[PDB]
Point group: D2
Chain length 462, copies 4
């Protein structure tokens, strides 16, 4: 036989090497810019971030840390990771004498589990926001039947705290009481579907009374934190973890911030740095994904610009404006508003489940996600970061609410005519002219705005 | 006021971030103007890189194709389904007997997800000892008892070793340890083992002691796909792998698992699929990195080509030719040869440590890595995949051996002139004309070959 | 030369070891010349003591009757079989529905053996909080998170509490915690709880959350045998107990477990017997203490007599009469009374701590113990079994309350005169004529009654 | 109704209160003095020990330690426990500045598990002598199938070391190699059926090379240790646990010895005392069994007498003399002799199992126990302490060997005539005149010697 020439296999563009995958990426590109993307955890990152993500940085193995690698060839990888770490501190206004950061986690879930491994022993106790109350899997999750779902609940001992059953706010009194009975070694704040800000000072007061470490998972609001538009968890938390692909508008990666230097009121100093770095490598991960680190460095510089602070301001205002429109139609929002990037829409007063609204919205190129509410999820979660990154403002998000209003009206019209069971409901989705009209208006409205990451003019499917 | 989308979102990297753009360009030159001999490294294709840097990074798709948590996944599902079916085809697996999860972020997440699926916390694991060629994720604790690897933190690990004299895996001591220790899981595969694995013997040991058998084929997965080494799928219950080494894809992981009827209690069937998929999500990971999955799908298509089988053949032949050249100069290789992509070079007969040779080689743009040998590591590990991907053949790898020979000769001259201690050795690296002469010859030799992934002609830093 | 058997082996203790003989004689006088109010203490019979000190201590008999590891157990087997059948008869249990293991060395080994039988390491357990009246073996960790009890070291425990105002068990907060925490095992029973237990409600909570239900009836086992309190066998899967408290036997433990068909998946039967017996031996214990088993068999026969049911009735009536007397003086009892063998005396309304009252009472040969109350413990626990075994009735226990009243009065006089701090309090104990006067009145009152276990007439230290 | 008077229920002798149990104790008393007791773990303790064991000390609750109890009334209990501890140190020639002891363990298995809990965390690694090689359950045991039997193997991670497959001695080279692969936190020496002395110095050399603590379980030879007739484990071990009812000839209890004071070649001191005491109480046990502690104090004083050192010398000589007689008949002993209180008799060369010899011996009032040998146990374990306590010397133990020789001859005669299967073998035990003749000669021989603990003249069944 004969080996392929480098020019054939190694330099030929994707559109020629693999038409199938190229065609599917092009279809996904159109889907992203011809619908309304309301997944609260999604964003549209920049072309610059994407160019660093798709680069020769993927070829380099660089196990270890800058200045203490396991092998050579890391002269420029070290500068990239050092730039990424220093830019990570600048984006969140942290002094390098009081804070450090590890930028090697592959994603948010590796970042959280590495933080747990660093400061906790197996079976140590952890408290996190309950999933039906707005928490995340990695904060601990086991079912009513006792089945341990999350790895946090498998390798550690978790116990959730809940929001108030009626107001929807975090019950800080019941949080403190459970923390005193349970005595966790680590308390986690932050969540995935909580529509209000966090009282980190009260969390610090509870952690000090029970003797726990305080960690904040700011994955969802990290972009708002960098722009100083929400409460800063660094004022009170020992460790802060985050994703970088949500409101921060970067690549899919994770970071772990940790305190260093003198402790607040012997002459004790913090002992997190070595534990956190060792937990990431050599304990849990292998070689870093340097293409993610380089792309993250780009995203962190953009997050420090004045234009980004205006983006975070706009995300909050769009979420509020959208929430005001929905409540003006009589709809119920958890806590009756929002202070961040998302709204949590209670659908139980309409006799609807999140599944039905999400399915019909998806048929209209409106991507939301069903989400549990306090108490077959009875709500949908709606986020503003992604569509705001396309340039939408308050008036545009009121139009989104109008589309959502039309979609729920069609959901109720279908349910009233065919039935409450899924098999009955599905009958109304086949050959529905009103759905096809709603999708047409979404598509035309979505095409009105720009799209970052790629050029619509160069798209395959226009 | 918000920035216009065209300004922040569509502007090329070279304008948005000159600092990072310049550093990527410098790393591009380093990759194509030196000799890359890290056995775990490769140079992937531009096609893989174009899929890696694409709008697929924007999509959240928690769950599995056909079983997602939310919508918008019409095209993501087809990409992951294509990736899974191409993974089975690339390794010649029947879909009724094998399944695969392609969501692991990397190789270490892939191994820990497999452990979580089939093991309870503190269950016992046996893996190849690190000084014998093993990997961290197979278990590692220090002399003091400090648990380094997460495998040794959340599970109970015990290593097995190569034969103290031959350097081959001691299958007799493996079986003896397996019966004393009674592991629930035995791991085969390694990072610096220069021979093939007897998976049939591992199955005999696993059946005698009652353990599951997992193979971590990360390093030789490309050779396995091309059927140039023994296939672990013939005997192992689970096969994990990276996709960025000899497979020449993006940085990702996969978990292969058996399906269907068991081989001779009743008509029992395998029970791995649901446990493995659940362990990846929702247990350990969050949303998959769909840009990795799409790039992996491209890599798996390329791995099924006739050109890739010829590449795997060439990697093996280059490793032999390099090893044959080194032994002709009197140097010592562990097991006295190789049957895969790498050679393990024993430096103790020369009175050298792996640290010194690696440091001087790096000053000449020759990237190797110090590596423990059976027993301050006394060896260096050298791999053929990366330079073979640039088009080098046997004669070119014999010149690489000449460069290595020159480097070790300079290392001994420094040690004889300044001393055996590292601080003494460093004195010989300051303003060394012979090192700078070797660096110049490496650069000129490296510039002779093509480079996948990007165009050398469009590089920022020329010559 | 070896000593003759008659010299070392047959000589009485009074000659072999005068030092220890003298100390036992002094302890004999202390036991019958003071007021013993430790709720967990009793005075067992001479018959029990004769079996306890017998040649049964010489026999090794690892295993179970009819399933031993070696021979010579013809008579040991009959003794253990008698002990087991008498254990079921004493608590009115059908042998087809209940079994019992009588080999635990004490109560704490009995509880930990039950945990080992039905739980895996780190499984979750709920037990009565120590400040609410619980016991160490039900789980205990400090404010700092330090795991004190072995139950909290090898398992994951979480306490439930009494109502903050009434002092009764908060069954609503119990169920709420059981659903959040999801324990595999819920423990009922306690050491200082002055009311009866609603085992039916515990069964409803255990069934709703999916837990096993165990009762530790150590303190009230004598009252249970005489059917003077609620029976935990009606609702619990497992019942553990000591045998030296209200049961008035030797220091040993037992584990009762359900057998036979389950109450309404299929025709399921209980699976406790083999797990519990295996947990005791060979898992946790070695050879049983057959002298304890023989003495226990004697105690269980005595516990089945009509005289024992009258003793249990009297213990309850004495506790009420003592508590009624204390409340007539204005003192505060937790839950304002009792339904069992003890009273829990709240001293915080008097501005006193349990430590001070216990110290002054001990100087007067009145043995109580400081005990936490809901919330430097602010209470003392007082029990009726021991003094009731000496023949005291209600009028005699009202005199005991008068002694306690005098003791607390002296405690307050010292605190008012010297101070609230412990170092201040100690100043009032030096050469206190009122304390010495109270001690004299306790001695004269204590000498009025008989004493089981030994003959007061043959004591070494008379008067 | 009416309560029983104290004189009736509380002062009446056992023979009247419970004739059934009294009759069974009397039958057990005769069985003990009219047969040959060769269970290596059994002894006959003194009447003085028994009088302290059966005393009013059983009525006292005394949770805690002397000088730091939880409640009052402990003036005399404290003196008894303090006497017991100081006598424990004297019996083993320990300086109180270098060694402490806790005398509260209920038995040997509680003593070992309390020591493990004190110095180890759950799932820490332990190495102990394999059961087929002469080890004990509490040192760790899991089956070939992987079933975890011992609580040591359930709550900790155990791995056994073995004797040499041919010589029967401990393989110290393979011990060191396994310790270096496995890296235990605790190494246990001592065993239940090992017929030779221990090289504690080599055990210390292995423990120091791998970084482990060294514990000796001297339960079986504790009497020989007190009399300084075998190697002392205190010279090299960090912790020493023991029972008190075997060769020490005391009550059924346990003790934990631990090092204190300056360490051997900073100015570090030992940290065992607080950990060991806390593990016993409040961690694992409740109130001490003060009747056991008082009886133990008596036994420890007797163990310090010159008569006891002569007893330990005689136990060793009786075991050797018995072993010499058996080997003179062609029988096989593990390691071909003994250096302590027992012999391990290999029955496989005779085509016999331990079950058959033990069953036939038991029918002749000869109590041995089947015991695994290196490799359906193929051996029997025979001990000298109990019969030596009755005054038997070398000539008497050669008569025991003659009885054992006759018993095995009858076992082979039965097996040759009826078969190797248990059902075949049992046929030869029914109405066997030779067995009844052997039992008659054992009974007459056993009646020739005295019996401690009780007066044969006062027995019920003579
Ligand atoms: C055999 C093996 N398995 C798993 C991994 C982990 O892969 P990730 O870095 O993607 O987590 C490695 C990395 N081996 C790196 C080397 O030999 O240089 C490996 O060699
Ligand atoms: C608060 C939080 N933390 C961690 C993660 C995990 O991130 P990765 O998927 O990169 O592992 C998520 C994902 N949240 C997904 C969602 O809300 O839709 C999250 O919401
Ligand atoms: C060495 C050793 N250690 C501890 C124990 C346990 O002692 P207790 O039974 O008191 O728990 C034994 C019992 N050995 C019993 C035998 O060899 O027959 C033992 O032999
Ligand atoms: C309810 C309960 N359970 C178990 C135990 C332990 O029993 P042992 O001491 O035999 O291990 C106790 C001791 N309670 C002691 C007291 O209340 O004073 C107890 O009160």
């Amino acid at each position: 036989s004969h080996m392929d020439p480098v020019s054939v296999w190694g330099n030929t563009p994707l559109a020629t090497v693999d038409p199938e995958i190229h065609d599917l990426i092009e279809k996904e590109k159109r889907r992203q810019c011809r619908g309304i993307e309301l997944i609260a955890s999604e964003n549209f990152t920049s072309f610059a971030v994407i160019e660093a993500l798709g680069s020769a940085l993927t070829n380099k193995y660089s196990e270890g840390m800058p200045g203490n690698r396991y092998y050579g060839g890391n002269e420029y990888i070290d500068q990239i990771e050092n730039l990424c770490r220093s830019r990570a501190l600048q984006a969140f206004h942290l002094d390098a004498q009081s804070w450090g950061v590890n930028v090697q986690p592959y994603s948010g879930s590796p970042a959280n589990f590495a933080a747990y491994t660093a400061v906790l022993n197996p079976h140590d106790r952890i408290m996190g926001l309950d999933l039906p109350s707005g928490g995340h899997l990695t904060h601990g999750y086991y079912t009513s039947g006792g089945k341990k779902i999350s790895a946090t609940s498998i390798y550690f001992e978790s116990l959730p705290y809940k929001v108030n059953s009626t107001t929807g706010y975090i019950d800080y009194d019941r949080l403190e009481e459970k923390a005193l009975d349970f005595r966790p070694k680590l308390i986690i704040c932050g969540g995935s579907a909580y529509p209000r800000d966090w009282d980190y000072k009260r969390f610090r007061e509870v952690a000090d009374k029970c003797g726990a470490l305080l960690l904040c998972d700011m994955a969802h609001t990290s972009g708002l934190v960098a722009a100083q538009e929400v409460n800063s968890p660094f004022e009170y938390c020992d460790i802060v973890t985050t994703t970088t692909h949500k409101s921060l508008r970067g690549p899919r990666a994770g970071m772990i911030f940790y305190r260093k230097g003198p402790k607040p009121p012997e002459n004790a100093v913090y002992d997190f740095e070595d534990k956190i770095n060792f937990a990431v490598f050599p304990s849990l991960q292998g070689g870093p994904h340097n293409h993610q680190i380089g792309a993250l460095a780009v995203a962190l510089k953009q997050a420090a610009s004045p234009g980004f602070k205006a983006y975070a301001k706009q995300v909050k205002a769009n979420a509020v404006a959208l929430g005001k429109y929905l409540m003006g139609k009589g709809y119920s929002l958890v806590t009756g508003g929002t202070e961040n990037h998302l709204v949590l829409w209670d659908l139980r007063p309409l006799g609807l489940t999140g599944n039905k609204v999400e399915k019909l919205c998806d048929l209209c190129n409106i991507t939301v996600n069903k989400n549990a509410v306090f108490g077959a999820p009875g709500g949908v979660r709606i986020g503003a970061p992604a569509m705001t990154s396309r340039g939408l403002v308050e008036k545009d998000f009121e139009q989104i609410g109008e589309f959502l209003h039309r979609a729920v009206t069609l959901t109720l019209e279908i349910q009233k005519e065919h039935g409450k069971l899924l098999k009955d409901f599905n009958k109304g989705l086949v050959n529905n002219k009103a759905i096809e009209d709603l999708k047409a208006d979404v598509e035309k409205f979505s095409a009105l705005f720009d799209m970052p990451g790629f050029l619509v003019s160069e798209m395959k499917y226009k």
